[PDB]
Amino acid sequence: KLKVAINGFGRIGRNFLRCWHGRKDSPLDVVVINDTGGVKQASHLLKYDSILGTFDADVKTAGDSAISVDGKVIKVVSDRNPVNLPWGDMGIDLVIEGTGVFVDRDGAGKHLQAGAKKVLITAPGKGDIPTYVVGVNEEGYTHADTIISNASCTTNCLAPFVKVLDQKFGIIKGTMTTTHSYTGDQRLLDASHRDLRRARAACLNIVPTSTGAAKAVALVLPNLKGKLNGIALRVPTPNVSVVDLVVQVSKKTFAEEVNAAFRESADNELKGILSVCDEPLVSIDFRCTDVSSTIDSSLTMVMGDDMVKVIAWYDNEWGYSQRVVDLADIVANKWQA
Amino acid sequence: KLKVAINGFGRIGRNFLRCWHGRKDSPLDVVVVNDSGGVKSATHLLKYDSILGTFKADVKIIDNETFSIDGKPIKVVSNRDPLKLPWAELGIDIVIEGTGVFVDGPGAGKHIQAGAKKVIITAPAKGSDIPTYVVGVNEKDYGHDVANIISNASCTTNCLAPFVKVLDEELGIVKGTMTTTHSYTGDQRLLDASHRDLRRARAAALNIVPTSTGAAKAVSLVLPQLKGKLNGIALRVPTPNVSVVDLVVNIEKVGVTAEDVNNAFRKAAAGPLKGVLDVCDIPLVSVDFRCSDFSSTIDSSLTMVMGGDMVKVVAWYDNEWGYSQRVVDLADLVANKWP
Amino acid sequence: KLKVAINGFGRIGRNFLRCWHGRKDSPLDVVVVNDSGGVKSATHLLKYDSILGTFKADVKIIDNETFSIDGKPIKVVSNRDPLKLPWAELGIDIVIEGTGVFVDGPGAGKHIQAGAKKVIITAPAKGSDIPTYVVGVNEKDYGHDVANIISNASCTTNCLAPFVKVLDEELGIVKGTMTTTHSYTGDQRLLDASHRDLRRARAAALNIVPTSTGAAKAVSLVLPQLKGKLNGIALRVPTPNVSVVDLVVNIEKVGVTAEDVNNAFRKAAAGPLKGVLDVCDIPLVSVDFRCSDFSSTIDSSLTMVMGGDMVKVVAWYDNEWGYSQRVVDLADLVANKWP
C-alpha cells in the first residue's frame, strides 16, 4: 500500500530489500532503486552476496533502467544528487536513505524536494531529527515526522536490553565497549581517512574507533542522558558484532536474576526484538538473526551486588535491516496523508 | 644531487620513500609529497604501517606543511590537479607518479606542464607513447633525451620478466600460460560493493578472486621476442602482501631436467641478475618474503619439467616493497644518466 | 563543430589553413594560430604565397591579435613554449603541430598539458609511443580513446604507402629500393652555411643534394607486412615544390607486364583509393601537379617491369598541398570519430 524508494543500494540497502522479500503481506513496496551503480551492479550484488550468500530468488537484469526479482519489476536510476531523482514523478511515499552521506536536515531533505514524502535514514540522525529504535520508543512516532533515523546498528542492540535493566534495577551510570565487525567505512589497506584509526588495515587490526550509540541510547531512553558512554573495537570479521555493557544499578542484584528479567521481557514485550541464548556459541552462529539483540546468558556476571556486565550479540547488517523494515513497516501503518 | 617529488602517498609511494631513506646514498632527494591529507595524514602513515611496521626514525611535523625524517625536511602539498603543482617553483627533477590515475601520455605529462623535468609512472602506461622498463632486463635501453615519461611496468611483470628472460635466453621459450596467486590490493572492495569489475567488487578478504591481468602480455614490452606468446589470469587471495607466479611455458630446447633449469637461474642469479633474481632452496611461505629486495625469487623445490618440453616455475615477490625498490633503482638510473 | 588550433604557421601549417578554408564543410574550425610574428607577419604570408599564389579572399587584420578570413575571426598568439598557450582557455580540441620540433611524446604532449584535447603531428614521430596513420591505407586503425597524439607520417611516406600497398596487396612485394627526386625544403641552407648535415648545408637552389630519409622504412609503420623490406635515399633538386618517387621492388608474383601493373592502380584508383591514388597517362612535368589533391599520382608511361620479377614505378606528389590535404582529412577523421 506504501510506495518505497531505496537510495543507497549498499550493504543496508540490499540487506533491507532482501529482508523485505521475506516478509509476508508487507505494507511496503519497493519500486525504485538509486545507487551510483548500473543495472548490472544492482542485479549481481543483490543475487550474489558474500555474507548472506546467494539470494534464493530469480534475479535478472530486466530493462536498461530496471531489474526483476521473481517478476516484481524495479527501476534503477543513478544521480549523485538526490534533488534530481524522480521521487515526485513516481509518487515516492518513503525513501530509505542508506548512503551514509545524507544524514542531516539539509541532505536528507533533497529527497523531499525530489518529490518524496518521507525519508527514513538508515543511520543515526545528525542534528535535530526524530530517532526511534523499534522496541524502545516506536510509539513516539507520528505521521507528522518527515525525517526519522532508525539509529545505529549498535544502539539498536544496546537499547532494548538497557531499557530492561534501568526499567528494573535503575541504571546509575555505566560504560560499554562494542567489539564490532568491520564495515565499508574502513580502509582495506593503510590509506587516508579522517579517522587515522579507521584509516588502518581493518583486516589486520583491532581498530579502536568511537561510537555514538553511547549517547544515542539517551536519544531514545531520555532517562539515561549522560549516564552511558563507550568506545568500539573493529575486529577482522565481516559481520555480526558483540556489545559489552557495564552498568551500576541501584537495586542490589545477582547473576541469574538479571538474565531472568531479560528472558521475561524477551518472551513478552520485546518478543521478536530481544532474546537470550544459553547454548555457548560464537559470532558466525548469529548470522541472519531477525532479532535486534541476543543476550549470551552464560556470560552475564555481577560484582559487589550492583555492577552488572552483559554481553550481547547482534547482526549489524541483517538484524538492523529487519529493524529498518519494521520501522518502515510502521510508517505504512499509522499513515494518514 | 637531484630533486624528487612523489605524487601519491599511498603504499607504493610510501613504500618508495621508505626504500629511498635507508639507502647507500641515492642521487635522489625527495623534497615534496602530494598526499591529499596534509602533514598529519601523510606523517602518521609514514611512521606507522600495518605491513612494514613502525618506521625506524624521528618523523616530526614542522610547519603546517613540512614534516621531517631525521631533520631532513619534506614539503608537502595537496591537489588532485597536477597543473596546480609547484613543480617548477620547487624545481622538481623527477616525479614518481604513484596514483594509478595518470598513466597515459596526456595525463602523466601534466606534471611536465607544471614544471617537472622527468616523470616515472609506478604502473603500466595506458598509452603506447611511453617506454616500459624493467631493471635487470632492458634498463640500458633508457638514455636521457629519450622520452621524459617512463613506466616501471607492473609488480607482476617486474617479477616475471627477469626470470622469463633467463628462460628464453638460455632454453628458448616456445610459448606458455601463467597464473599469479596475488595478495589483495587497494583497488578491491573491502566488502561486497559497487565496482566496475564484479570480481574486485567482492570482499577482498574472504574470496579467491579471479581478475584479468595484462602483466603477462606486457612482458613483451621489455622482451620483444616473446610478443604475443605469454598470457594468463590472476587470483586474489586473503593475504595483504607478497605474491607468487605460476609460469607454465613448454620450452623449445631439448627436454632438460628440473634441477638444471634451476641452475640457469642460480647462475644468472649470482651473475647478471645479482640483485634482481635469486633462488631459495629452503621451503618457506609467503610471509618469509616480506621486505625482499629481489624482484623475483624462485622456489627451487617447486620447479618441475613435465614432458621434456613443458617447464613449470614458481616465483616469490613482495609486490609492495620489491617493486618500490626497483622504482628507486629506475629513478636511480635516470640520475646516473643525467647531464 | 570542433575547435582547431594550428601551432606553426609555415608552409605546411599555412597550406593547412588554406586547404581547410575552401572545403565542403569540415567539422574542423581553426580559431587560433601560433605564428611567432604577430598578425602582420601571419596575415601577409597567408594572403601572398610564392608557391600557391595570392589567397582568394578578404583577409583583414582585426584587433592587434585577431585577423579574419572573410569575416570569420582567428585569434593569433605567439610563444615558443606550448605550456604558455591558451589551449584550455580557448578550449582547443585539435592541435596541428606543424613546427617539426615537437615530434616526440613528451614534446607534442606539452599541448595537452596546456589544455588541448588531441594533437596531430604534421611529420614522423621521434618516439615509438605514437601512432602513424596514412589516409587511404590504415586510417580505420584510428579510434577515439586510442592515443591522443598521432602522426600523419611523411610527405614522401604518404605518397609511397598508398601505391606501395596496391603493389604488395595485389602482386606481393618481395622487397626493393627507392629514390625520391625531392623539391628542396626549409630545412636546407639558402647558401652554403653551417648545418648539422653537410649536404643540407649546401645551396638548396644550386645542387642535387643527397640526404637520408626514413620515409622508406616508415612505410612499415602503416604496412607491417613490409617491415624492413623497403629503403632508400632522397635527392634535393632546385624545384620549390612537387616531387617524384622512384620505387624499384622486384615482385613476388609471376612476372606480369608493364601496363597491367598500371591497371591495378587504375583499378584501385577509381575504387578504394578514389581521392588518394590516381594515374595520369598524359606526359606532363612537375609543375603540372601543383595543387594536386591526390596523395600520389603514377606516371603511366614511366612504369616498366624489367626481368619479370623487377617492377619500377614513378609517382607524382605535391609535398606541400597534398600532404596538407591529407592532414585535413586525418583531422577530419578525428572529428567524425568523436563522442
Ligand SMILES: NC(=O)c1ccc[n+]([C@@H]2O[C@H](COP(=O)([O-])OP(=O)(O)OC[C@H]3O[C@@H](n4cnc5c(N)ncnc54)[C@H](O)[C@@H]3O)[C@@H](O)[C@H]2O)c1
Ligand atoms: N552495515 C552496518 O553495520 C550498518 C548498520 C547500521 C548503520 N549503518 C550505516 O548506514 C549507512 C549505509 O551504508 P551501508 O551499510 O549500506 O554500506 P555502503 O557504504 O555500501 O552503502 C552506501 C551505498 O550508497 C551508495 N551511494 C552513496 N552516495 C550515493 C548517492 N548520492 N546516490 C546514490 N547512491 C549513493 C554507494 O555507492 C554505496 O553503494 C552507513 O553510513 C553505515 O555506517 C551501517
Ligand SMILES: NC(=O)c1ccc[n+]([C@@H]2O[C@H](COP(=O)([O-])OP(=O)(O)OC[C@H]3O[C@@H](n4cnc5c(N)ncnc54)[C@H](O)[C@@H]3O)[C@@H](O)[C@H]2O)c1
Ligand atoms: N604497493 C602496491 O600494492 C603496488 C604494487 C605495485 C604497483 N602499485 C601501483 O601503484 C599505484 C598506486 O596505487 P596504490 O596501490 O599505492 O594505492 P593507494 O590508494 O594506497 O595509493 C594512491 C595514492 O595516490 C593518491 N591519489 C589518488 N588520486 C590522486 C590524484 N588525482 N591526485 C593526486 N594524488 C592522488 C591517493 O591519495 C593515495 O595517496 C597503482 O597503480 C598500483 O597498481 C602498487
Ligand SMILES: NC(=O)c1ccc[n+]([C@@H]2O[C@H](COP(=O)([O-])OP(=O)(O)OC[C@H]3O[C@@H](n4cnc5c(N)ncnc54)[C@H](O)[C@@H]3O)[C@@H](O)[C@H]2O)c1
Ligand atoms: N610544406 C612542406 O614542405 C612540408 C611537407 C610535408 C611535411 N612538412 C613538415 O612540416 C613541418 C613544418 O616545417 P615547414 O616545412 O612547414 O617549415 P616552416 O619553417 O615554414 O614552418 C615552421 C613553422 O613553425 C614555427 N615554429 C618553429 N618553432 C616553433 C616553436 N618552438 N614554437 C612555435 N612555433 C614554432 C615557425 O615560426 C614556422 O611558422 C616539418 O617537420 C616538415 O617536415 C612540410
